[PDB]
Amino acid sequence: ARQWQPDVEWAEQYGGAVMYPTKETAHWKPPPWNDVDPPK
Amino acid sequence: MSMVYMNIMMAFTVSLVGLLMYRSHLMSSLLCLEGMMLSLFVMAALTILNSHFTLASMMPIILLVFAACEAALGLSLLVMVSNTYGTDYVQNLNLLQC
Amino acid sequence: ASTSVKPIFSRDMNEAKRRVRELYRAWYREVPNTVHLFQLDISVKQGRDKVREMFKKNAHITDPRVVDLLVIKGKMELEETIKVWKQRTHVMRFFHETEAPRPKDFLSKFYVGHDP
Amino acid sequence: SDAPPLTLEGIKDRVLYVLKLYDKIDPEKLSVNSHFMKDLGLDSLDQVEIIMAMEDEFGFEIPDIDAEKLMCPQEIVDYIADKKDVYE
Amino acid sequence: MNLMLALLTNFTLATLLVIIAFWLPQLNVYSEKTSPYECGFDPMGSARLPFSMKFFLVAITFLLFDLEIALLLPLPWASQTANLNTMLTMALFLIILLAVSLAYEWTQKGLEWTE
Amino acid sequence: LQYGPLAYILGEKATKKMTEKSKLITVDGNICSGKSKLAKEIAEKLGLKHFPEAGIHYVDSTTGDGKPLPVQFSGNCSLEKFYDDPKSNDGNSYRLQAWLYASRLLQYADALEHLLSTGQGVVLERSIYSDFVFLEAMYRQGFIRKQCVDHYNQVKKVTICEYLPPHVVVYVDVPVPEVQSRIQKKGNPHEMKITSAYLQDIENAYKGTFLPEMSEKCEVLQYSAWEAQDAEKVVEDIEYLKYDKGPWLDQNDRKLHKLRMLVQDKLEVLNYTSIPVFLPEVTVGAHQSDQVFQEFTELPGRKYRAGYNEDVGDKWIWLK
Numbered sequence: 125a126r127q128w129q130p131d132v133e134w135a136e137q138y139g140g141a142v143m144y145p146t147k148e149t150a151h152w153k154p155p156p157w158n159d160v161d162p163p164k
Numbered sequence: 165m166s167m168v169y170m171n172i173m174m175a176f177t178v179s180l181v182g183l184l185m186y187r188s189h190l191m192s193s194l195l196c197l198e199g200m201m202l203s204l205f206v207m208a209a210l211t212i213l214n215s216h217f218t219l220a221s222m223m224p225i226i227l228l229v230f231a232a233c234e235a236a237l238g239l240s241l242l243v244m245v246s247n248t249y250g251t252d253y254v255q256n257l258n259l260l261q262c
Numbered sequence: 263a264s265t266s267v268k269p270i271f272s273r274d275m276n277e278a279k280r281r282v283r284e285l286y287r288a289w290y291r292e293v294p295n296t297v298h299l300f301q302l303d304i305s306v307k308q309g310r311d312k313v314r315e316m317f318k319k320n321a322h323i324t325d326p327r328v329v330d331l332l333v334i335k336g337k338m339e340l341e342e343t344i345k346v347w348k349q350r351t352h353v354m355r356f357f358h359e360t361e362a363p364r365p366k367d368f369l370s371k372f373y374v375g376h377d378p
Numbered sequence: 379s380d381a382p383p384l385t386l387e388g389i390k391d392r393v394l395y396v397l398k399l400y401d402k403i404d405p406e407k408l409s410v411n412s413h414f415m416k417d418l419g420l421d422s423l424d425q426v427e428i429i430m431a432m433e434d435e436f437g438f439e440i441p442d443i444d445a446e447k448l449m450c451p452q453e454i455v456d457y458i459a460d461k462k463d464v465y466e
Numbered sequence: 467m468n469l470m471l472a473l474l475t476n477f478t479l480a481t482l483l484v485i486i487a488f489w490l491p492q493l494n495v496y497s498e499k500t501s502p503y504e505c506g507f508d509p510m511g512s513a514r515l516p517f518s519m520k521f522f523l524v525a526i527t528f529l530l531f532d533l534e535i536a537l538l539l540p541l542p543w544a545s546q547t548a549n550l551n552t553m554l555t556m557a558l559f560l561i562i563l564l565a566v567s568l569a570y571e572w573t574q575k576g577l578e579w580t581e
Numbered sequence: 582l583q584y585g586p587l588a589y590i591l592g593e594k595a596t597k598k599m600t601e602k603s604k605l606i607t608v609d610g611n612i613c614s615g616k617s618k619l620a621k622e623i624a625e626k627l628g629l630k631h632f633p634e635a636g637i638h639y640v641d642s643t644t645g646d647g648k649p650l651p652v653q654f655s656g657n658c659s660l661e662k663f664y665d666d667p668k669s670n671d672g673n674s675y676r677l678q679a680w681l682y683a684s685r686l687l688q689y690a691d692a693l694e695h696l697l698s699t700g701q702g703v704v705l706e707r708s709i710y711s712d713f714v715f716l717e718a719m720y721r722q723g724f725i726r727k728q729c730v731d732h733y734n735q736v737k738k739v740t741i742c743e744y745l746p747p748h749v750v751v752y753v754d755v756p757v758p759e760v761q762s763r764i765q766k767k768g769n770p771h772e773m774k775i776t777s778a779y780l781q782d783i784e785n786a787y788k789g790t791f792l793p794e795m796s797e798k799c800e801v802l803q804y805s806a807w808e809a810q811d812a813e814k815v816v817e818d819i820e821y822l823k824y825d826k827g828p829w830l831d832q833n834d835r836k837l838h839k840l841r842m843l844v845q846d847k848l849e850v851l852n853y854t855s856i857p858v859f860l861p862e863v864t865v866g867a868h869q870s871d872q873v874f875q876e877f878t879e880l881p882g883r884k885y886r887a888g889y890n891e892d893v894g895d896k897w898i899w900l901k
């Protein structure tokens with residue numbers, strides 16, 4: 125009987141734009157990994 | 165004080181409100197930033213010249229030299245925004261926090 | 263053999279009729295901003311109808327080499343309207359807005375002159 | 379939000395909407411499995427114009443090779459589903 | 467009272483000639499008369515002039531040089547000071563620091579036009 | 582004196598060491614196209630140095646003793662297993678592609694440093710710019726999913742934009758039917774299972790999205806199987822190039838300083854290769870990741886920083 129450690133479902137809770145999704149923040153996206161939006 | 169002090173301070177409030185209420189243009193706000201400096205230049209010069217504060221006569225010039233230099237910094241940022249969005253609208257500056 | 267002939271771009275009609283469609287797409291998606299830059303007084307409707315007419319006249323062709331030239335010349339006629347080498351007058355020379363009608367009925371040709 | 383996942387029923391309403399606004403197609407006989415050329419009496423270039431019209435409402439490029447097979451509204455709906463990965 | 471009267475005249479006369487120049491002649495304008503000249507050919511595109519960075523730097527470079535001028539304009543009166551040792555130090559400090567600004571732009575390829 | 586801002590100030594500027602022959606040559610090709618034989622001679626006859634194509638054990642070659650490490654410290658990715666059961670449910674297919682890209686990305690950083698460190702040129706086989714041929718070939722055959730492509734693309738864009746493309750690209754062409762025959766006579770039991778339709782995608786990618794895009798940045802010298810057999814023609818062609826295009830024409834000491842400070846540090850080259858995107862194929866559970874990391878530190882010369890390991894006969898540890 126091993127110790128429980130976080131799985132993918134637990135981890136993904138911290139992988140969003142905000143910790144508490146709501147109606148107003150549903151459109152947000154995580155930023156780029158290098159802080160560079162593609163030119164256009 | 166004097167009737168002049170009222171209208172010169174009236175000019176600072178008007179320029180400030182214009183700077184704190186953006187319409188669409190970053191450039192149009194930079195003008196309000198320079199308008200505020202002009203009123204401060206006039207207010208300081210009136211008091212210093214009207215009180216024979218000789219050594220203080222150079223302060224208005226130092227105010228103009230530095231305020232102009234910062235405006236050059238501001239214009240540079242405005243230009244670099246135009247190379248990235250094809251305009252100078254403030255609403256294009258919403259990537260951060262949204 | 264004499265019948266054998268070197269190709270231009272397409273080796274048969276099925277491959278040759280592909281370019282006609284790709285060319286047609288370029289024209290159909292170029293009239294709206296052609297009519298804009300040139301400031302013409304024709305709607306995008308009858309502008310697109312004109313391109314339909316031009317293709318429909320070369321519809322009886324059956325030679326892959328003849329079709330390739332009609333596409334090669336078609337591409338040139340497009341590069342001039344996108345790079346605005348043509349002036350407002352060149353684009354409006356398709357619509358013939360200054361030539362009086364030449365009736366086809368026999369009596370009309372008989373009344374006017376000797377031509378057939 | 380306000381961008382629900384695409385659905386085959388949802389697509390077929392978007393596909394037919396374009397076909398409705400086409401002066402050369404009679405809306406009464408629009409159907410959903412009616413061929414563009416067998417019954418509607420459209421020429422080759424009409425199908426090309428439709429495929430171009432379908433691209434503006436569904437932003438993506440349909441290569442000409444693919445357009446040679448899309449000859450009925452259902453096949454158009456199937457093609458988009460085969461491309462945007464909507465099965466339901 | 468004399469400067470204002472002189473300024474008004476130089477700008478009243480300049481204005482009086484403009485009003486008698488847009489009204490005296492006989493005008494007849496049609497569509498092609500009023501079109502921008504261009505070069506005798508229909509315009510190629512509909513987008514305003516693209517921004518050129520080299521032209522902005524010369525404006526900024528002129529401005530900062532023009533700001534150090536205002537610090538040097540009072541030199542004629544600054545030479546009547548009793549403490550000339552300090553004045554000659556600062557006057558040559560401002561000018562020397564104006565040559566380093568030129569030297570920096572020169573060496574950083576800031577005074578070139580070959581993009 | 583390790584390279585750094587002080588060294589750059591004191592004089593170690595890149596442009597003071599690179600000659601006219603300091604170039605980074607990439608030699609591409611398909612499976613069994615003989616690029617290795619060609620590549621080893623371009624470096625030989627131009628005074629450059631050669632880099633063998635990045636294998637699954639490439640990183641272990643530049644660290645520690647330089648010998649391959651057991652398979653556990655690699656994700657259990659084995660090239661042989663890819664051909665046998667490419668559609669495996671354990672996700673070994675993409676995990677092989679993901680690992681190889683990292684090794685090639687690490688290899689490219691080593692190459693750029695060598696060019697910018699001593700001035701010598703470098704010859705490389707399939708690099709990070711051409712690595713995507715295999716990935717999109719696998720996708721079409723169904724060896725990976727759509728989401729595996731998306732994860733690869735994200736790692737590519739945030740990692741490839743920081744580097745410079747090759748000076749010269751030497752592409753070798755070999756028709757697929759010829760490729761099959763060359764596979765048969767080399768006697769590799771695992772390789773012989775390569776379905777032909779798979780080797781056609783590598784050709785479609787190579788001449789459908791790689792050459793046209795790289796021709797507008799670098800110098801491209803296409804060859805055929807017979808032409809590539811001779812090295813003198815390749816060398817003289819690569820010695821009479823104009824070099825009229827490329828990002829290298831707008832490079833100065835300042836921008837090469839920013840590049841060398843990046844290639845020098847390898848934990849920055851690899852930073853985005855393990856971005857927190859929870860794909861089933863590349864994710865590792867907490868218990869397995871911790872268990873393996875424990876074994877790794879128990880190997881000879883891996884417990885402490887290189888140079889403070891008594892078990893490999895290091896001395897002066899108490900003053901080093």
Ligand SMILES: Nc1nc2c(ncn2[C@H]2C[C@H](O)[C@@H](COP(=O)(O)OP(=O)(O)OP(=O)(O)O)O2)c(=O)[nH]1
Nearest residue numbers: 610611612613614615616617618678681712715772
């Ligand atoms: N899926 C995948 N396989 C790869 C990749 N790089 C190499 N391989 C595989 C394809 C081959 O079966 C094997 C070796 O490829 P090679 O280019 O080295 O061909 P080969 O050694 O047989 O002849 P050659 O090097 O040209 O002399 O490794 C990759 O990035 N992805």
Ligand SMILES: [Mg+2]
Nearest residue numbers: 613616617634
């Ligand atoms: Mg090999």
